[PDB]
Amino acid sequence: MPRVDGDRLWASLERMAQIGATPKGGVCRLALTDLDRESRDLFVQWAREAGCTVRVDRMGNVFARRAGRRPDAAPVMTGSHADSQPTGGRYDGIYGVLGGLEVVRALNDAAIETERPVDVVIWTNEEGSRFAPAMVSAGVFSGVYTLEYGLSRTDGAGRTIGEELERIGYAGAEPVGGYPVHAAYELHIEQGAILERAGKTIGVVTAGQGQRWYEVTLTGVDAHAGTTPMAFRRDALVGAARMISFVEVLGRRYAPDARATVGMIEARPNSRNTVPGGCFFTVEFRHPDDAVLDELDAALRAELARVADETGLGAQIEQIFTYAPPFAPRCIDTVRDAARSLGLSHMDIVSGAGHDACYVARVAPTGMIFVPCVSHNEAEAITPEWATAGADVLLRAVLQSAQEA
Amino acid sequence: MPRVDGDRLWASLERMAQIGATPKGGVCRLALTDLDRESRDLFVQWAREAGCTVRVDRMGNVFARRAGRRPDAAPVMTGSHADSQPTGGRYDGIYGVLGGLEVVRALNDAAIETERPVDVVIWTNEEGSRFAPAMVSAGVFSGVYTLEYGLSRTDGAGRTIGEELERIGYAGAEPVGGYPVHAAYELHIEQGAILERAGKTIGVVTAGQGQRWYEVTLTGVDAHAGTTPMAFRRDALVGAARMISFVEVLGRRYAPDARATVGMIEARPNSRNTVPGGCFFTVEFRHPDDAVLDELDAALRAELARVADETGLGAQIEQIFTYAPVPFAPRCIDTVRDAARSLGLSHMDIVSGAGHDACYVARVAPTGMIFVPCVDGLSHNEAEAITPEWATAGADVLLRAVLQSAQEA
Ligand SMILES: [Zn+2]
Ligand SMILES: [Zn+2]
């Protein structure tokens, strides 16, 4: 099997990172800005230079197609997003886009004919910063959202995605999704420390995380600290402290894949010489298994009831967000087998963040490939070896799928 | 032994409560306002009608003196403040003042002569709302503050205490403090629910609380919750939670008199989907025993170090306020307790959880305090209330205490 040109890949990442470069060495390329256009334009140029046919759909998704023996066969698709967070890094999303480009180049150098066409994609507005929601364009593609909804999303100035697509010249003619896709692979940095600390180069992504978000309000009695003895108190902050501790306990209880976090708290009146009579805090559970999330939910509620009973606090809880994550076994195995045949260190991993691939999974057999990083930060970084390794895994996986009858 | 006239005392409280009456049934009578002046003038009028000689000092403190057999003898002093919080009750401070007036009237009715003169005092600006700080005038009296400091405290209008004293006619000529006082007693509502819930009418106040205040900053690592396994986390808020729970443990460990509280917390960045990398919170200890406060300090600092170690969090702690406990005079305390006993009144020892003028006066005179309960422990609220029975009982104890000390050679 062929090999990617690591130096060529690295050079393209270096070149692309100039567009929207921040002084801290990060990237600010918000969706459908002029800088987004400049980045898109450069990809298009490079793709066409690689002999690809580049098309654009009505959500401005860019597809660079490399020829296959069967021009009407469902393609193998790979890619990611080019747009960033306001204080994004040089590799969030774009590494997957340029990794896909290097795959095409590598197939060209090896003079390989595939049975199926290969599409390298840029998804519009993945990060969901200028327009909400995130992953909206892959969402339209995958039937999560309608085209009407996708195009009507507005920024702070009241400009819609549809209006901006026309402004920067990416109001494409192609339908958004609706055609069969044989398989899809997204190469992405981990945006975490699991691979790096485990000393593993390749993350075989098995699933996304399910999520449960809660808001909890504890009600006690505002009291002067000096004049109120401990036995008379209804301290809502102490009640919350008990819950915060128990949330951490729950996270460790369902290790390694559970995420359990209290990230926001507000005490009232929040004055140092008064017993807090109220406290609001959030809870979020993440785990790839809905059954485990149900356990976490039941434990949280049962404990909240015990705390209220013991403390005499009033308690209210409300689940405010619920999300169920599944990648295809075939793609997962293909990714693992590719890593193995390349002699690359690897491990199964769960994605702790959303990606376009999470939605593409709904319409085509989909997998993801993670590489380590030293995210959502201007200092996030990968090594040339990591960049090459992820791209070599991508090449192998895409090639295998593309030769499938 | 003489007895107070409960109906008379109650009538005086109802009448005074008219001055600055609020629709919610409270009192809004800020220090050195015209309402405060009216209240002062009425007390002065009643005191003179009861045969007292009234004097005013340079901080506007009002002293009504009931003559003693030996005019040059050190006086027994009693009283409180007449001024209120913006949403004050009908009994915060003024109960002690009118209690003192009732003591004078009761001594008159019984035709009693005392060895020592008795002073009934109104302290200027106790509540410290219009001018900061609180208890500033008893403070000057007691050496806490200079006269220059006391007179120069300004309100939001740029007007000083000195200027306002002159405006309302209470820029007195007498020196502020600096003379021998035989004993001092202040009658005051508890401003807490200890007496009410224990079913005790009289609180024998043994001390005012010492205080130690702290600021604590825990430093962790900002991290996205979904992508960060528990084992990698440096959660500053969980660290704080551990400390908050421990602070409660410390308060309950030194029951019944310890107060241990985390009243303020600030997490950062305080977003629901991220592991908090920073957390600020306050700690305050209160206790009548400085040795216990020392132990609380040591325990807090020891556990903070243990938690920082075990969690991998950076920790910072600063004691930003220190206040020594104010024990009251043993003889005054015993005098109060003995009085309650002789009157067949239910009573218990209690520690004051709030500052009073008497806390400062304790520095320059043998001082004690007498508490009565208040409904629900409510105070500095317009719905603050005592019963006639409680009002009468507090005044009866004050009468006997003042009487005993004023007859001491
Ligand atoms: Zn991304
Ligand atoms: Zn008071």
In order of A326, B187, B337, B347, the CA distances from B203 in angstroms are 69, 10, 9, 6
Extended beta strands in B93-189, E state: 118-123, 183-189
Q: A-chain residues within 8 Å CB-CB of B353?
A: 224, 226-228
| Structure tokens given for B256 | 């019944």
Extended beta strands in B15-126, E state: 53-56, 62-66, 76-81, 118-123
The DSSP secondary-structure symbol of A178 reads -
Extended beta strands in A148-264, E state: 183-189, 202-208, 210-219, 223-224, 259-261
Total residue count of chain B as it appears in this document:
409
What is the spatial distance between Cα B56 and Cα A215, in angstroms, rounded to a whole number? 59
Q: Do A271 and B251 touch (CB under 8 A)?
A: no
Q: Which of A194, A264, A371 is the best residue to mutate to test the B interface, defined by the most B CB atoms within 10 Å of its own CB? A: A264
Structure solved via: X-ray
SS3 A212: strand
CB atoms near residue A110 (< 10 Å): 13
| Structure tokens given for A345 | 């260190």
Match 């600092």 to its residue by tokens.
Answer: B301
Angle (CA) A176-A371-A7 rounded to 5° is 90
Q: Which residues surround ligand 2, an ion (CB under 5 A)?
A: B 92-93
Instruction: Provide CATH code, domain A1-209+325-405.
Output: 3.40.630.10
Give the resolution to one decimal, in Å.
2.0
Question: A187 CB contacts (<8 Å, ≥6 apart)?
Answer: A78, A80, A95, A96, A99, A100, A368, A369, A371, A390, A391, A393, A394
Q: What share of chain A is helix, strand, coil (3-state, %, to 5)?
A: 35, 25, 40
Give the torsion through C-alpha atoms of B268, B272, B273, B278, to 10 deg.
Answer: 20
Q: Do B265 and A270 touch (CB under 8 A)?
A: yes
Q: Which of A87, A196, A221, A262 is the best residue to mutate to test the B interface, defined by the most B CB atoms within 10 Å of its own CB? A: A262
In order of A78, A101, A180, A333, the CA distances from A97 in angstroms are 8, 6, 21, 22
By the 10 Å C-beta count (0-12 exposed, 13-18 middle, 19+ buried), B231 is classed as exposed
Q: Do A240 and B238 touch (CB under 8 A)?
A: no
Q: B-chain residues within 8 Å CB-CB of A231?
A: 255-256
What is the spatial distance between Cα A153 and Cα B367, in angstroms, rounded to a whole number? 73
- Identity of the residue in A251, A275, A284 whose CB atom sits nearest the CB atom of B272: A284
| Structure tokens given for A159 | 């400009």
List the binding residues of B.
Answer: 81, 92, 126-127, 188, 380
User: Distance between alpha carbon B38 and the CA centroid of its chain, in Å?
Assistant: 24
Backbone angles phi, psi at B351, to 5 degrees: -105, 130
Q: Do B238 and A248 touch (CB under 8 A)?
A: yes
> B210-324 sits in which CATH class?
alpha beta
C-beta of residue A311 within 8 angstroms of C-beta of residue A270: no
Through-space distance between the first and last CA atoms of chain A, rounded to whole angstroms: 18
Match 């920082």 to its residue by tokens.
Answer: B308
| Structure tokens given for A42 | 């450069």
Q: Which residues surround ligand 1, an ion (CB under 5 A)?
A: A 92-93
Q: Do A286 and B197 touch (CB under 8 A)?
A: no
What is the spatial distance between Cα A76 and Cα A398, in angstroms, rounded to a whole number? 7
Q: Which residue of B has its CA nearest to A222?
A: B263
C-beta of residue A292 within 8 angstroms of C-beta of residue A209: no
Q: What share of chain B is helix, strand, coil (3-state, %, to 5)?
A: 35, 25, 40
Query: What are the structural domain ranges in chain A?
Result: 1-209+325-405, 210-324
Question: Measured on CA atoms in the order B397, B399, B401, B404, is the torsion positive or negative?
Answer: negative
C-beta of residue B245 within 8 angstroms of C-beta of residue A245: yes
| Structure tokens given for A334 | 């293909």
Q: Which residue of A has its CA nearest to B257?
A: A229
Backbone angles phi, psi at B8, to 5 degrees: -65, -50
Chain B nearest CA to A270, separation (Å):
4
Total residue count of chain A as it appears in this document:
405
Match 């959502």 to its residue by tokens.
Answer: A376
Q: Which fold has domain B1-209+325-409?
A: Aminopeptidase (3.40.630)
What is the spatial distance between Cα A125 and Cα A139, in angstroms, rounded to a whole number? 10
Q: What count of Cα atoms within 13 Å lies in the side-chain half-sphere of residue B280?
A: 9
- If you measure from the C-alpha of residue A92 to the centroid of ligand 1, how many angstroms do you get, rounded to a whole number? 4
Q: What count of Cα atoms within 13 Å lies in the side-chain half-sphere of residue A319?
A: 13
What is the spatial distance between Cα A203 and Cα A224, in angstroms, rounded to a whole number? 54
H helices of B345-387, where? 357-361
What is the spatial distance between Cα A96 and Cα A136, in angstroms, rounded to a whole number? 18
Give the containing element (helix H, strand E) for B6: helix B6-16
Give the containing element (helix H, strand E) for B315: strand B314-323
What is the spatial distance between Cα A99 and Cα A90, in angstroms, rounded to a whole number? 13
Backbone angles phi, psi at B143, to 5 degrees: 85, 5
- If you measure from the C-alpha of residue B96 to the centroid of ligand 2, how many angstroms do you get, rounded to a whole number? 9
What is the spatial distance between Cα B209 and Cα B353, in angstroms, rounded to a whole number? 6
Give the containing element (helix H, strand E) for A123: strand A118-123
Angle (CA) A41-A46-A50 rounded to 5° is 145
Q: B-chain residues within 8 Å CB-CB of A261?
A: 225, 235, 273-275
Q: Is the backbone peptide bond immediately before A71 cis, with ω within 30 degrees of 0?
A: no
Nearest to A78 by CA among A106, A120, A114, A46: A120
In order of A117, B93, B188, the CA distances from B360 in angstroms are 89, 15, 15
- If you measure from the C-alpha of residue A191 to the centroid of ligand 1, how many angstroms do you get, rounded to a whole number? 8
CB atoms near residue B292 (< 10 Å): 17
| Structure tokens given for B137 | 């005038």
Query: What are residue B187's DSSP bridge partners?
Result: B370
Q: Which of B222, B273, B319 is the best residue to mutate to test the A interface, defined by the most A CB atoms within 10 Å of its own CB? A: B273
User: Distance between alpha carbon B78 and the CA centroid of its chain, in Å?
Assistant: 15
Helix-then-strand count for chain A, H and E: 12, 15
Angle (CA) A233-A235-A237 rounded to 5° is 165
Nearest to B354 by CA among B122, B125, B188: B188
Backbone angles phi, psi at A55, to 5 degrees: -120, 160
Chain B nearest CA to A372, separation (Å):
12
Question: A220 CB contacts (<8 Å, ≥6 apart)?
Answer: A233, A234, A235, A236, A239, A275, A276, A277, A278, A279, A311, A312, A313, A314
User: Distance between alpha carbon B302 and the CA centroid of its chain, in Å?
Assistant: 32
What is the spatial distance between Cα B169 and Cα A117, in angstroms, rounded to a whole number? 99
Q: Which residue of B has its CA nearest to A249?
A: B230
CB atoms near residue A149 (< 10 Å): 14
What is the spatial distance between Cα A48 and Cα A42, in angstroms, rounded to a whole number? 10
Q: Which residue of B has its CA nearest to A281?
A: B272
C-beta of residue A221 within 8 angstroms of C-beta of residue A237: no
Give the torsion through C-alpha atoms of B106, B109, B111, B116, to 10 deg.
Answer: 20
- Helix pair angle (B34-49, B94-109), 10° resolution: 10
